[PDB]
Amino acid sequence: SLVPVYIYSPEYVSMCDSLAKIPKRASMVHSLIEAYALHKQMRIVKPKVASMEEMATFHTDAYLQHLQKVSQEGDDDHPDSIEYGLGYDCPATEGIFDYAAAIGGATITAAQCLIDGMCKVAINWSGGWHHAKKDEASGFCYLNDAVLGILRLRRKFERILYVALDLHHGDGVEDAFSFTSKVMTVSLHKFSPGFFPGTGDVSDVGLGKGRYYSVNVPIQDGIQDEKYYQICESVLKEVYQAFNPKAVVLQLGADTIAGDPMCSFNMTPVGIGKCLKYILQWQLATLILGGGGFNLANTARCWTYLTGVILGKTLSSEIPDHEFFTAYGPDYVLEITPSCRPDRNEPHRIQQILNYIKGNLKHV
Amino acid sequence: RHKKX
Ligand SMILES: [K+]
Ligand SMILES: [Zn+2]
């Protein structure tokens, strides 16, 4: 009941390994967690596959049927695919519908675990694909498992907070709940013209009855642990005080970590860990999700460290022997060292963004 | 529409 649920099965991880943009990442992530024996301190729960009905609670039938169609053989040359956002970012690799349904079902399973009181924390490190819209794939996302998980949590919880610490704006989740006040979305992300997905300015606050229940923290290149936590803590403080969430869905994309090929933010898992800690302190039902992360070893280093944070365990600095040990050479340590490049975030711009958010939350 | 990626 105080032991975290860990969504895992060998067959699930294998399916997640087949995602075109992150091959073998799921295995590496689970393998490192196992090498630190953290799984022995968690309740391993095998994920159910998301039914068509569960998927259609957010995704349109036309899009679902298309995804299912091209997924059968692997038709990544189907002419109608561009309408549904399939193509370069989201290729129609065969089985992708079933793979996406497994991840969708995995996040739903985690949510159900939280509803039933089995745990206060549930983890799906292979979820967090928060870009996908109701009728189109987007940003390596085919099904929006985060939205599916949130819709599941809505069975018990009347006020759900979504926090995305991914490098990219969680536009799909924000879109899904743009018009409602039951769910508040909070996204910290890089915001710069031409940078995916191009949305999520501090002025974007949702629409209609959902106005001011969308929160965006636009951030520039090169932010590091200290400044990032200061921003995050001060935003989450106001949000908690104003929104009074009953449940939290936390997306922890590792594409902000130094050494990611995207080379934008300059974070270490320790900085993200402090953000996670601040949220965990609320002692609310918390769904933990992964996301982006394209330095695979570093992404495993990050989420392994974060699992330790969840368990309150200090981990050994040395990477333990396991299947992918050689991927962590030549230093073989868990810690990540930041790059020596500039922080483009002026403190005055940061402060104004902050105060602008403070003002918006007053209406809440 | 943007490219990610
Ligand atoms: K909202
Ligand atoms: Zn991302």
Q: Rg (Cα) of chain B, in Å, rounded?
A: 5
Per-chain residues with Cβ under 5 A from ion ligand 2: A 166-168, 253, 255, 292
Q: Where are the domains of chain A?
A: 1-364
- In DSSP terms, A250 is beta-bridged to A163, A288
Closest Cα to residue A275, out of A247, A237, A246? A237
CB contact under 8 A, B4 and A194: no
Contact of A274 with A231, CB cutoff 8 Å? no
Class of CATH domain A1-364: alpha beta
The total number of residues shown for chain A amounts to 364
CA–CA dist A317, A227 (Å, integer): 24
CA–CA dist A317, A207 (Å, integer): 46
CA–CA dist A124, A127 (Å, integer): 5
- In DSSP terms, A45 is beta-bridged to A7
CA–CA dist A295, A324 (Å, integer): 14
Closest Cα to residue A256, out of A269, A238, A274, A273? A269
CA–CA dist A115, A296 (Å, integer): 32
φ, ψ of residue A171 to 5 degrees: the values are -70, -35
Q: Among all residues of chain A, which has the CA nearest to that of B3?
A: A196
3-state secondary structure A284-349: CEEEEECCCCCCHHHHHHHHHHHHHHHHCCCCCCECCCCCCHHHHCCCCECCCCCCCCCCCCCHHH
Taking CA atoms, A156 is separated from A111, A151, A279, in Å, by 10, 10, 20
First to last CA, chain B: 13
Residue A224, class by beta-carbon neighbours within 10 Å (0-12 exposed, 13-18 middle, 19+ buried)? middle
Name the experimental technique.
X-ray
CA distance to partner chain A, nearest, from residue B5 (Å):
6
Q: Could you tell me the distance, in angstroms and rounded to a whole number, from the CA of residue A255 to the centre of ligand 2?
A: 6
Residue A91 is given by DSSP the state -
Residue A206, class by beta-carbon neighbours within 10 Å (0-12 exposed, 13-18 middle, 19+ buried)? buried
Q: Could you tell me the distance, in angstroms and rounded to a whole number, from the CA of residue A260 to the centre of ligand 1?
A: 30
How many CA within 13 A on the CB side of residue A187? Answer: 32
CB contact under 8 A, A140 and B2: no
CA distance to partner chain A, nearest, from residue B1 (Å):
7
The yes-or-no answer on residue A131 being catalytic is: yes
In a mutational test of the A interface, the residue from B1, B3, B4 whose CB has the highest number of chain A CBs within 10 Å is B4
Residue A93 tokens read as 């690799």
Residue at A192: amino acid letter: S
Per-chain residues with Cβ under 5 A from ion ligand 1: A 177, 206, 210, 213-214
